[PDB]
């Protein structure tokens, strides 16, 4: 420990603190809420930590002490002030007690204390402590992949390279963390370090890295955008997916195994389209065996053996696909000539053939990317300039063999490898790489995949959906996984249920080759075949709302949303009640069945369904069933061919056609499914969805504007599209426009004006009349927001919309408002009457493992409801633990008081 503070002097460019024992800090003020506290025992103060290696060069700030200027440091004053010395700007007082030293901030705006260390920096076993004050009500999000979890309040989190891919690992660390109180922290230390969130004293967070530095960035806002905003200011905004890059992908090894016909029914076997059976061997694994050799191209009578073969099987079952890693396996390569060059030569083939069909070409690496020659290449070295350059490979994953190091390696391997893409494709090829063993920045470059599990089995969704919460939270939005795992399989329901829930996330990976079963969306009977298609075509037709949130992420909310980062007023929204479900974007609340929990009929039994608000009506998007928000559902009955996803009333939902790849959307057309609830607004995205232009300005984006009654009411309904502001290459200025507006009856009238000109539209006598014209609406009781759905599980999913068309306008020059006099959407809501009803009525110690004798229940001031008996069950608690309880009926005219 360091000592009292002697003094604190305004040096040149920071406040410099000396403590009694010699020892100094540096305070760098960067702006009116960030600021960097180092105390280095050196006294070398260098701008940047030393990394693991003198040749790992990426750093973890993308924005330099000096690129934030000199004001807010210019505008910040040192006081001794008695018994304190205090740092004053417009944004914070920064107060060190002279005796003890120890540091609290005062967020000027909200008048109160943020942030206070309660013991004195702690430097013993080679390691460096903070100690901090934890208040009652004081959550804590952060620490990258934390897998398995996502709110840290009464835990202890490992920032560490775990290499370890299942529940309870790390894996890919990130050394922030912040706070519900409204700061959050990056330690600048490419050091393992734990951060313990008072599973001791609840009173007391303590901050652990290994070293002697102590060196950290503090920023202090008041949202958790801001929040998220700050730490991309520092670290680097996160890169945007090129649109391919939310396709899914296939992933295997196309250049090394062998196939030998087996029987049917021997261990291994697939059933190929000549109609005999093989099985796969490794070359070493064949022993006395003869079999058929993979290659990429298929060109040595081993067509159905090829990575050609498996885009034909894609495009024959009708399934998106993005892109395709053809090398992805120990050993295996791209090619099977004595040459880099002639192997360069049969990967360029493969992504002619792979473009041909719409698809992009990506690279697996275990190693290093470049020959240690590059002028002079050995066969089997890398030499990602020459794949990108002559064989167009866009995408990479980093495999653990290659980044396992972690820390400072892999950030320097992703920022040189982001480089390569952007080099050799003069900007043509923004990044899209997908690693793990990440760091404090990681997210300017790569997304992540959370690694090596099993699927086939419930617990593969169950950890699976805290990890991606957690990951966002963390400041990394392009978050994925394994399509129902690298190992295992052989589960039907488990494998439609990962399908379904992942269409509502970025990244979706077919990592093929190690399973129970071949790793496709048509690996198992027709009826999961058709629901895998069903939910792979809805989130190709919801790629304009996918890629506006996407845009968003760059500078603001992640996509995958904590419950808490849309409501931050409800408890509820902070807890592990919020773990198994989320905000897809802020119109989607997305619940999936992670269990293998079923009723007598063998619908899905899902509890704990936590719909925020009490003012809001949330729409289940395949039926139109309204539920009222401010309850928990327990018991909610899900078929096979459905996953909860509610609709949060008001939103507009920007869609397209479906497509199995970004080439096959109809760019001279616009969509937008909208459920109108009061005044709501969208900021519609778009780019040429490939390149780094985006970065200088080449996007466009349109606002759409939904002016109508609040739910279930009737009223004037205005739908205004602001002329579209931007360009890009190829950007595609007249468009025909769709609006499909829910509505519960046909209207009064509807009328069109584009840019300040009446454009009169017919009522369409039918549907067929509907599709065929322009210039027309439509009052439509058979809407069906997904056909391929409809088909796939068997029933009609009817709902009421009423859709205006309106023929090819420039989105540039011309304006829309249309304006419907009768609008109404109006359903029965499960919960509707939320007022208290004075004309209505009001422990099982047997089963206690706790059971209580429609109804409401009360658990620790959390409501639950569709409670359909005089009793329910509470799980999910600690062993030996107490809980506080009390119930209300619910009848037609409200819900009785509690008790
Ligand atoms: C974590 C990771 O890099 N996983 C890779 C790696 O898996 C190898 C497994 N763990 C093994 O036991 O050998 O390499 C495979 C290659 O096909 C996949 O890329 C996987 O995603
Ligand atoms: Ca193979």
Do not use: C
């Not at 599990?453 to 400041?475: A, D, K, N, V």
């Amino acid at each position: 420990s360091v000592g009292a503070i002697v003094s604190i002097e305004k040096a040149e460019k920071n406040f410099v603190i000396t403590y009694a024992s010699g020892k100094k800090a540096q305070i760098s003020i960067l702006n009116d809420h960030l600021f960097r506290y180092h105390l280095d025992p050196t006294g070398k103060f260098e701008e940047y930590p030393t990394p693991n290696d003198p040749k790992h060069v990426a750093k973890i700030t993308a924005k330099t002490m000096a690129d934030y200027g000199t004001q807010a440091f210019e505008q910040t004053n040192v006081t001794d002030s008695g018994n304190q010395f205090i740092l004053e700007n417009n944004g914070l007082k920064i107060i060190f007690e002279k005796e003890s030293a120890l540091m609290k901030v005062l967020d000027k705006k909200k008048n109160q204390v943020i942030l206070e260390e309660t013991a004195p920096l702690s430097f013993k076993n080679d390691k460096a402590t903070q100690t901090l004050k934890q208040s009652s009500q004081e959550n804590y999000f952060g620490g990258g992949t934390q897998n398995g979890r996502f709110t840290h309040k009464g835990t202890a989190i490992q920032i560490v390279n775990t290499n370890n891919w299942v529940d309870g690992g790390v894996a890919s660390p990130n050394p922030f963390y912040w706070s519900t109180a409204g700061y959050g922290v990056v330690r600048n230390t490419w050091k393992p370090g734990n951060y313990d969130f008072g599973s001791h004293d609840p009173q007391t967070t303590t901050t652990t890295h290994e070293g002697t530095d102590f060196d950290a960035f503090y920023f202090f806002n008041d949202s958790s955008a801001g929040i998220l905003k700050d730490y991309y200011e520092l670290t680097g905004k996160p890169a945007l997916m090129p649109e391919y890059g939310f396709y899914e992908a296939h992933l295997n090894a196309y250049n090394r195994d062998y196939w030998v016909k087996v029987a049917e029914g021997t261990a291994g076997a697939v059933k190929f389209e000549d109609g005999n059976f093989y099985k796969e061997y490794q070359p070493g694994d064949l022993g006395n065996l003869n079999g058929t050799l993979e290659s990429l191209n298929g060109e040595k009578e081993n067509y159905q053996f090829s990575a050609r073969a498996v885009i034909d099987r894609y495009k024959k079952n009708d399934m998106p696909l993005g892109w395709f890693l053809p090398n992805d396996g120990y050993g295996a390569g791209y090619g099977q000539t004595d040459s880099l060059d002639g192997d360069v030569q049969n990967l360029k083939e493969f992504t002619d053939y792979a473009q041909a069909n719409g698809v992009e070409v990506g690279l697996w690496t275990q190693s290093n990317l470049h020959p240690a020659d590059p002028k002079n290449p050995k066969k089997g070295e890398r030499d990602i300039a020459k794949e990108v350059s002559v064989a167009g490979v866009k995408a990479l994953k980093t495999n653990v063999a290659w980044v396992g190091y972690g820390y400072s390696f892999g950030l320097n391997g992703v920022e040189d490898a982001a480089n390569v893409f952007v080099k050799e494709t003069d900007g043509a090829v923004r990044p899209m790489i997908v690693s793990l063993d990440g760091w404090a920045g990681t997210q300017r470059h790569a997304g992540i995949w959370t690694g090596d599990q099993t699927g086939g089995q419930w617990e593969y969704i169950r950890f699976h959906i805290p990890t991606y919460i957690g990951t966002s939270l963390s400041g990394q939005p392009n978050v994925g996984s394994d399509m129902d795992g690298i190992f295992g399989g052989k589960n039907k329901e488990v494998n439609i249920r990962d399908f379904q829930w992942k269409t509502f996330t970025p990244v979706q990976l077919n990592m093929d080759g190690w399973g129970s079963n071949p790793k496709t969306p048509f690996a198992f009977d027709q009826e999961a075949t058709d629901l895998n298609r069903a939910y792979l075509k809805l989130k190709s037709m919801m790629m304009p709302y996918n890629y506006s949130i996407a845009k968003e992420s760059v500078d603001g909310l992640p996509m995958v949303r904590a419950m808490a980062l849309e409501f931050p007023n409800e408890g509820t929204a902070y807890t592990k009640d919020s773990q198994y479900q989320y905000m897809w974007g802020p119109n989607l609340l997305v619940a999936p069945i992670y269990n293998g929990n079923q009723d007598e009929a063998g619908n899905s039994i899902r509890d704990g369904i936590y719909l925020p608000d009490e003012k809001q009506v949330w729409v289940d998007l395949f039926t139109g069933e309204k539920y009222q928000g401010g309850r928990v559902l327990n018991g909610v009955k899900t078929p096979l061919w459905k996953v909860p996803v509610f609709v949060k009333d008001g939103s507009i939902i920007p869609m397209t056609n479906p497509n199995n790849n970004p080439k096959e959307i109809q760019r001279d057309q616009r969509s937008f499914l909208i459920y109108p609830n009061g005044a709501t607004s969208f900021n519609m995205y778009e780019d040429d969805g490939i390149s780094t232009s985006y970065e200088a300005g080449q996007s466009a984006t349109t606002k759409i504007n939904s002016q109508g009654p609040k739910s279930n009411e009737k009223g004037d309904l205005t739908v205004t599209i602001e002329p579209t502001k931007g360009s890009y290459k190829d950007f595609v200025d007249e468009r025909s426009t769709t609006l499909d507006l829910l509505a519960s009856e046909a209207p009064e009238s509807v009328t069109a004006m584009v840019g300040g000109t009446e454009v009169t539209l017919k009522q369409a006598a039918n549907k067929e009349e509907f599709l065929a014209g322009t210039n027309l609406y439509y009052f439509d009781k058979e809407f069906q927001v997904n056909q391929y759905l409809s088909e796939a599980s068997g029933e009609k999913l009817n709902q009421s919309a009423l859709s205006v068309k309106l023929a090819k306008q420039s989105v540039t020059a011309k304006d829309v408002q249309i304006t419907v006099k009768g609008f109404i959407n109006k359903g029965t809501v499960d919960g509707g009457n939320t007022t208290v009803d004075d004309q209505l009525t009001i422990i099982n110690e047997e089963k206690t493992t706790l059971t209580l004798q429609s109804y409401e229940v009360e658990r620790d001031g959390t409501v639950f409801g569709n409670i359909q008996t005089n009793t329910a069950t509470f799980d999910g608690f600690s062993f030996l633990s107490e809980h506080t309880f009390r119930v209300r009926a619910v009848g037609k005219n409200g819900v009785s008081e509690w008790s």
